Design an enzyme around this catalytic site. Structure first.
Site, mmCIF file in Angstrom:
data_model
loop_
_atom_site.group_PDB
_atom_site.id
_atom_site.type_symbol
_atom_site.label_atom_id
_atom_site.label_comp_id
_atom_site.label_asym_id
_atom_site.label_seq_id
_atom_site.Cartn_x
_atom_site.Cartn_y
_atom_site.Cartn_z
ATOM 1 N N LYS A 189 -10.136 1.359 -16.952
ATOM 2 C CA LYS A 189 -10.600 0.009 -16.633
ATOM 3 C C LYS A 189 -10.861 -0.805 -17.901
ATOM 4 O O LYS A 189 -10.595 -2.011 -17.929
ATOM 5 C CB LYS A 189 -11.845 0.079 -15.744
ATOM 6 C CG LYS A 189 -11.558 0.635 -14.348
ATOM 7 C CD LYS A 189 -10.466 -0.160 -13.654
ATOM 8 C CE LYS A 189 -10.392 0.238 -12.174
ATOM 9 N NZ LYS A 189 -9.744 -0.821 -11.359
ATOM 10 N N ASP A 234 0.866 -1.168 0.000
ATOM 11 C CA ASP A 234 0.000 0.000 0.000
ATOM 12 C C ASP A 234 0.904 1.219 0.000
ATOM 13 O O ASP A 234 2.061 1.151 0.424
ATOM 14 C CB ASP A 234 -0.940 0.007 1.214
ATOM 15 C CG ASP A 234 -2.173 0.874 0.998
ATOM 16 O OD1 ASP A 234 -2.043 2.120 1.046
ATOM 17 O OD2 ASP A 234 -3.273 0.312 0.790
ATOM 18 N N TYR A 268 -11.628 6.995 -15.533
ATOM 19 C CA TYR A 268 -11.729 5.707 -14.861
ATOM 20 C C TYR A 268 -12.235 4.631 -15.814
ATOM 21 O O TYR A 268 -11.674 3.527 -15.880
ATOM 22 C CB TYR A 268 -12.653 5.851 -13.646
ATOM 23 C CG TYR A 268 -12.784 4.618 -12.781
ATOM 24 C CD1 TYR A 268 -13.793 3.696 -12.998
ATOM 25 C CD2 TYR A 268 -11.909 4.390 -11.733
ATOM 26 C CE1 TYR A 268 -13.925 2.575 -12.203
ATOM 27 C CE2 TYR A 268 -12.043 3.272 -10.924
ATOM 28 C CZ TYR A 268 -13.054 2.369 -11.170
ATOM 29 O OH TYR A 268 -13.193 1.244 -10.383
ATOM 30 N N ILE A 273 -19.379 -1.226 -4.446
ATOM 31 C CA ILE A 273 -19.056 -2.009 -3.258
ATOM 32 C C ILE A 273 -19.150 -1.093 -2.047
ATOM 33 O O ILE A 273 -18.620 0.023 -2.069
ATOM 34 C CB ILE A 273 -17.647 -2.631 -3.358
ATOM 35 C CG1 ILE A 273 -17.520 -3.492 -4.621
ATOM 36 C CG2 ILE A 273 -17.313 -3.456 -2.110
ATOM 37 C CD1 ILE A 273 -18.533 -4.623 -4.719
ATOM 38 N N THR A 317 -18.091 0.617 0.917
ATOM 39 C CA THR A 317 -16.890 1.015 1.648
ATOM 40 C C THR A 317 -17.117 2.418 2.200
ATOM 41 O O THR A 317 -18.123 3.055 1.863
ATOM 42 C CB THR A 317 -15.628 0.996 0.766
ATOM 43 O OG1 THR A 317 -15.712 2.034 -0.218
ATOM 44 C CG2 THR A 317 -15.405 -0.368 0.094
ATOM 45 N N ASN A 335 -4.536 -4.393 -7.610
ATOM 46 C CA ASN A 335 -5.797 -3.883 -7.105
ATOM 47 C C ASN A 335 -5.811 -2.380 -6.892
ATOM 48 O O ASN A 335 -6.877 -1.773 -7.015
ATOM 49 C CB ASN A 335 -6.139 -4.581 -5.778
ATOM 50 C CG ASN A 335 -7.225 -3.874 -5.004
ATOM 51 O OD1 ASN A 335 -8.409 -4.031 -5.297
ATOM 52 N ND2 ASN A 335 -6.832 -3.092 -4.001
HETATM 53 N N1 LIG Z 1 -17.106 0.383 -5.575
HETATM 54 C C1 LIG Z 1 -15.836 0.009 -5.482
HETATM 55 O O1 LIG Z 1 -15.178 0.125 -4.450
HETATM 56 C C2 LIG Z 1 -15.185 -0.558 -6.718
HETATM 57 C C3 LIG Z 1 -15.942 -0.890 -7.840
HETATM 58 C C4 LIG Z 1 -15.324 -1.394 -8.960
HETATM 59 C C5 LIG Z 1 -13.953 -1.525 -8.977
HETATM 60 N N2 LIG Z 1 -13.195 -1.180 -7.907
HETATM 61 C C6 LIG Z 1 -11.706 -1.277 -8.001
HETATM 62 O O2 LIG Z 1 -11.230 -2.008 -6.883
HETATM 63 C C7 LIG Z 1 -9.910 -1.549 -6.514
HETATM 64 C C8 LIG Z 1 -9.951 -1.210 -5.046
HETATM 65 O O3 LIG Z 1 -11.096 -0.357 -4.822
HETATM 66 P P1 LIG Z 1 -11.553 0.003 -3.333
HETATM 67 O O4 LIG Z 1 -12.876 0.698 -3.374
HETATM 68 O O5 LIG Z 1 -11.431 -1.220 -2.490
HETATM 69 O O6 LIG Z 1 -10.422 1.061 -2.917
HETATM 70 P P2 LIG Z 1 -9.966 1.732 -1.535
HETATM 71 O O7 LIG Z 1 -9.758 3.194 -1.759
HETATM 72 O O8 LIG Z 1 -10.880 1.285 -0.442
HETATM 73 O O9 LIG Z 1 -8.535 1.042 -1.346
HETATM 74 C C9 LIG Z 1 -7.587 1.239 -2.424
HETATM 75 C C10 LIG Z 1 -6.192 1.267 -1.852
HETATM 76 O O10 LIG Z 1 -5.263 1.654 -2.896
HETATM 77 C C11 LIG Z 1 -4.239 2.405 -2.299
HETATM 78 N N3 LIG Z 1 -3.551 3.140 -3.351
HETATM 79 C C12 LIG Z 1 -3.995 4.259 -4.011
HETATM 80 N N4 LIG Z 1 -3.159 4.687 -4.923
HETATM 81 C C13 LIG Z 1 -2.099 3.793 -4.864
HETATM 82 C C14 LIG Z 1 -0.895 3.705 -5.586
HETATM 83 N N5 LIG Z 1 -0.547 4.564 -6.539
HETATM 84 N N6 LIG Z 1 -0.055 2.689 -5.277
HETATM 85 C C15 LIG Z 1 -0.404 1.833 -4.306
HETATM 86 N N7 LIG Z 1 -1.512 1.817 -3.567
HETATM 87 C C16 LIG Z 1 -2.327 2.835 -3.897
HETATM 88 C C17 LIG Z 1 -4.979 3.274 -1.293
HETATM 89 O O11 LIG Z 1 -4.127 3.880 -0.345
HETATM 90 C C18 LIG Z 1 -5.955 2.253 -0.695
HETATM 91 O O12 LIG Z 1 -5.399 1.564 0.420
HETATM 92 C C19 LIG Z 1 -9.600 -0.383 -7.465
HETATM 93 O O13 LIG Z 1 -8.887 -0.843 -8.608
HETATM 94 C C20 LIG Z 1 -11.015 0.071 -7.830
HETATM 95 O O14 LIG Z 1 -11.077 0.893 -8.981
HETATM 96 C C21 LIG Z 1 -13.805 -0.762 -6.743
#
Ligand SMILES: NC(=O)c1ccc[n+]([C@@H]2O[C@H](COP(=O)([O-])OP(=O)(O)OC[C@H]3O[C@@H](n4cnc5c(N)ncnc54)[C@H](O)[C@@H]3O)[C@@H](O)[C@H]2O)c1
Ligand SMILES: NC(=O)c1ccc[n+]([C@@H]2O[C@H](COP(=O)([O-])OP(=O)(O)OC[C@H]3O[C@@H](n4cnc5c(N)ncnc54)[C@H](O)[C@@H]3O)[C@@H](O)[C@H]2O)c1
Ligand SMILES: NC(=O)c1ccc[n+]([C@@H]2O[C@H](COP(=O)([O-])OP(=O)(O)OC[C@H]3O[C@@H](n4cnc5c(N)ncnc54)[C@H](O)[C@@H]3O)[C@@H](O)[C@H]2O)c1
Lengths: 248, 248, 238, 248
Positions: free
Chosen positions: B159, B36, B155, B188, B190, B89
């Site tokens: 993606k 992270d 985004y 999701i 969060t 991720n």
């Molecule tokens: N609704 C959603 O949450 C959702 C929906 C579809 C896809 N996604 C995808 O799932 C993945 C995680 O989403 P999430 O909602 O769990 O995110 P989140 O923000 O809860 O967690 C993401 C993590 O990525 C870390 N991060 C950010 N930039 C970074 C970088 N440059 N290098 C390393 N770490 C970095 C952040 O500090 C954080 O801990 C992403 O690729 C997101 O686009 C999420």
């Protein structure tokens, strides 16, 4: 013609598909801005369009530079007064290498032209179209916006991204008198495939059920349709011109 | 556990989906590198994984920095000897604006993390996997790898590109004991979404036929399956976990 | 087992993918109704399952006959009390011929089994699942639910239809405690020309399809519905 | 006219999209066989086409009956000597019910018209096209060839099947001078929609990003393009005319 008095911008219009699109637009009465990074190609394209009786002017641009794309749209308006149609066509193929071997430089270069340059075009085209009552954008994607091209992972990723960007613009601008669609050509016989041996081209051809490569004019017919009022209920879509490549 | 003694890397593993993936991997016996950009989150994730009986270590990395991604894989090998599984991720949502209004730097920031960082991960992961007999990669995409997210064109574009990259890696490495697949979550639950009004949350839920948002653990179950030997004939594919969002 | 005390129905379970699905369900603790049009293959499947420590019973059905599919669900409830999981797997390849040459009856026969039989299964499975607290359906499609199989247009059309049916059920039943997803296998064991169309450089194994079916039939896939899930060795990636 | 010296067949041509396709074909110089189950609708369509200066003849047929489809193509050749273009458009909406509640007769009926009738058309069209050197088929699909229509599972199944049949014909006949493509309209303003209330139609329009329903002529323009030599490198493909419906 079906584009009479419309103003149309084409990037990468000095050769191949973009050249055929510029000719098609101009044959149907559009005032065409031919843009290319190569001024000799761009100037020759314009002179050839005018020799057939059409109206065109050349403006140099590197689509990876957002300042140059912004200036290109501004210059289009300065020359012809408005912007009605834009085809974001300029692109590069990139190096051929396995993804794990892919150069950082080639990744950046391919994504900068094939994706960022398309976004910069859309950005500044959209801003001008909202000033003159709307308009129509065609983004050049590829079959590799929906299927892989082994050894060309940057190209595939960029062309996939163009499909997504197109869906977004179509959805966002649906009630703003602006349409945006993407075209997905398969392999097209242009001087770009000059280096392939006859065996290599035969292998490429074997991946097209129609048993041949496509011609730039056949892509340009689809671009023309999607740029015209005939496609008035079509937006956000991806439109193959692939000789059956993705049907199997 | 179904990943017993596999070495598994997770980026963005300090929160949300990435944290759930890291916990799922560790519960199934993997030795997890939690990565992270936030040391506090990453170190806390490792502590929590260990308290539940699992094995993990923290390595800080900004996935938009290719030197740091290459160093992350190298550190994984220094700590646990090899790399068997990687989940790319880490991502960011980006500013919300119409495509014509989208910021130049905002666009590049979203692409740099959500696409380039996934490519850097795959590049240096593949490098190492070829040295230790193969491996499995899961790329985190989105429903917006196949449908638009109005006001989030960067985004969506990023993606979509991840989907294309995944197809390319799967095809290229099919006979190299390496698999690569992409997961497409819908929205999701969060803390990222806890800022929305009652109105906005209900409108978002209305776009999911299952009548609720997904949970991070539900995404992690699919990542786990695709990272295990149970998915042995699955590669290059895109796999929804979307509550029906894209079925309509 | 992850399917403990669930009741699962599998059509075409006497051989191939359906047999592997029935074995996988039973290994994970489900009570399995093995259904097949061939009694000998179905009874042998049940005996092999019980030899492995699982619980299974045979019910014959021709999935092209809607009355037999309705009876199949009724018998499932008579034997095991409920229906939690169904895999609509029975299919047939059909004649190989250009679309313009395809026989009228040959077309209908392929559609009747590969599409209508899946719909009849879904209809009567959904009917029962709405009585016993919901459930999960997996429909067996194919890579040819999204790409053509030259000389097999009836099969391709039928499997495309299964993908659409699956999207519709997933959307319709999203708030009714029922999920429905489709699996798309590539070719499952010249074979050289066929293998050359798979980037992984081999055909798939039936147990590899069954692992995906098991995942989609279990609580692990709880936010997955209406979706199409490839198990294709990379076939459709190019 | 871009269809000069061509003979074109349209099923379900007495109303709606089919009527518009028949008019578009005739306007471009084709000799048009207007087919419909409703003789009053079909004869009126022919009357209107001739009053616009076109050439057309009516032939009654129920596309679910293969003998009538065979006779339709035979009568086309008797009247105009050949068959160059065919649009398989006749279709029905079907019962509105949950899949578990769906009538067996309702399912059979929808599939017999919307799938089997399209197959019968293609079969006998292809047979004649092979006799006169090739031709072009357009199959009428729907947005519901790629996304669900809740309460219309038979319709969605059938239209998905049409997309698959189209891919197969395109791939199989690629080197036989025959092309086959599918059109996917969203919701189109016709008398069919007059049974919806002010509220229901507003809800339907809200699912189209362009903020309105389509017109039959807008579908016919895409059918005409895909029927003409302009689309010469396009086969096996699916082509949306959906006002952005499937972009999101
Ligand atoms: N609704 C959603 O949450 C959702 C929906 C579809 C896809 N996604 C995808 O799932 C993945 C995680 O989403 P999430 O909602 O769990 O995110 P989140 O923000 O809860 O967690 C993401 C993590 O990525 C870390 N991060 C950010 N930039 C970074 C970088 N440059 N290098 C390393 N770490 C970095 C952040 O500090 C954080 O801990 C992403 O690729 C997101 O686009 C999420
Ligand atoms: N087989 C094919 O040719 C094929 C297949 C699928 C998609 N495409 C896409 O079609 C488009 C055109 O391809 P083509 O084969 O006709 O190419 P081409 O090389 O024949 O012509 C492309 C032109 O783009 C110009 N160009 C490059 N970068 C530029 C920039 N930044 N600004 C302005 N001009 C620039 C080049 O100088 C050249 O004149 C590309 O987007 C390509 O990826 C082509
Ligand atoms: N290469 C492949 O094998 C492959 C690839 C993709 C998809 N599929 C799909 O997987 C499914 C099963 O394939 P398989 O390889 O296991 O086949 P298989 O031939 O090994 O077994 C199919 C079973 O279905 C039974 N069956 C046939 N018609 C039936 C009917 N009307 N009612 C009940 N049972 C009936 C047969 O008797 C047999 O037991 C089919 O839907 C097939 O189309 C298979």
């Amino acid at each position: 013609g079906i584009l009479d008095n419309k103003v149309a911008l084409v990037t990468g219009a000095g050769s191949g598909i973009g050249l055929a699109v510029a000719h098609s637009y101009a044959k149907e009465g559009a005032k065409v801005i031919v843009s290319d990074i190569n001024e000799d190609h761009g100037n020759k394209a314009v002179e050839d369009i005018k020799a057939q009786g059409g109206e065109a002017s050349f403006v140099k641009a590197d689509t990876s530079n957002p300042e140059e794309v912004e200036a290109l749209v501004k210059r289009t308006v300065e020359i012809y007064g408005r912007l009605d149609i834009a085809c974001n066509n300029a692109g590069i193929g990139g190096e051929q290498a396995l993804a794990g071997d892919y150069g950082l430089d080639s990744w950046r270069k391919v994504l900068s032209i094939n994706l960022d340059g398309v976004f910069y075009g859309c950005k500044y085209e959209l801003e001008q179209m909202e000033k003159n009552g709307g308009g129509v954008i065609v983004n050049m994607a590829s079959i590799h916006g929906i299927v892989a091209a082994p050894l060309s992972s940057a190209y595939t990723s960029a062309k996939h991204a163009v499909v997504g960007l197109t869906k977004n613009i179509g959805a966002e601008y649906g009630q703003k008198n602006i349409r945006c669609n993407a075209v997905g050509p398969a392999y097209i016989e242009t001087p770009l495939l000059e280096s392939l041996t006859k065996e290599m081209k035969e292998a490429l051809i074997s991946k097209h059920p129609m048993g041949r490569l496509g011609k730039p004019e056949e892509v340009a017919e689809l671009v023309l349709f999607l740029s015209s009022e005939k496609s008035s209920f079509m937006t956000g879509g991806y439109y193959l011109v692939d000789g059956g490549y993705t049907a199997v």
